[PDB]
């Protein structure tokens, strides 16, 4: 469980993401796909993209990263009281998309990397620790839901 102060460090960097969620989503996907190329294979609509240039030029990938980061932002704004938001996300990710916990760890690492590069004003050591705690909570709670749903993760 995160303290209020830790949540405020999470929300204060998220406020900067929200100046341009689409651009942050593009940087996070490009980071994820370059660092862990196997993750791109889970996206039927995007697995043909061959280069960072193609990923940046994809209007559909840009829209997807706005949907993904906005869903994450809604979770983080609940400050751990995210049961309702996790239910549909867990169900789709366990049963339709089949996204292992290790891949949620990879996207968490990409989110952290991008915030570290873009936002040193709001993403010093303490703020990064708070964001990691929040992402670790998310992944713990998703993994519990996965198990209830029948998926190993
Ligand atoms: C912070 C973690 C993540 C969040 C908040 C998130 C959120 C979302 C949301 C809101 C959608 C659309 C609704 C739905 O189908 O549930 C979606 C779709 C999808 N997500 Fe996730 N996602 C996350 C991580 C991942 C990761 C790591 C992968 C794969 C490695 C993944 C694969 C997919 C796929 C394949 C779809 C369908 C994409 C399409 O329509 O073309 N997601 N995600």
UniProtKB/Swiss-Prot annotation:
Residues 1-147 form the Globin domain. Gene3D superfamilies: 6.10.140.2100, 6.10.140.2110. It is an enzyme of class 1 (oxidoreductase). The modification Phosphothreonine is found at residue 67. One of its GO terms (cellular component) is sarcoplasm. It is found in: Cytoplasm, Sarcoplasm. The modification Phosphoserine is found at residue 3. GO terms for molecular function: heme binding; metal ion binding; nitrite reductase activity; oxygen binding; oxygen carrier activity; peroxidase activity. Heme b binds at residue 93. Changing residue 121 to A: In metmyoglobin. One of its GO terms (biological process) is removal of superoxide radicals. Its EC number is 1.7.-.-, 1.11.1.-. Keywords: Cytoplasm, Heme, Iron, Metal-binding, Muscle protein, Oxidoreductase, Oxygen transport, Phosphoprotein, Transport. Pfam families: Globin (PF00042). InterPro entries: Globin, Globin-like_sf, Myoglobin. It catalyses: Fe(III)-heme b-[protein] + nitric oxide + H2O = Fe(II)-heme b-[protein] + nitrite + 2 H(+); H2O2 + AH2 = A + 2 H2O. O2 binds at residue 64. Nitrite binds at residue 64. Monomeric. Monomeric heme protein which primary function is to store oxygen and facilitate its diffusion within muscle tissues. Reversibly binds oxygen through a pentacoordinated heme iron and enables its timely and efficient release as needed during periods of heightened demand. Depending on the oxidative conditions of tissues and cells, and in addition to its ability to bind oxygen, it also has a nitrite reductase activity whereby it regulates the production of bioactive nitric oxide. This is Myoglobin. The lineage of its organism: Eukaryota, Metazoa, Chordata, Craniata, Vertebrata.
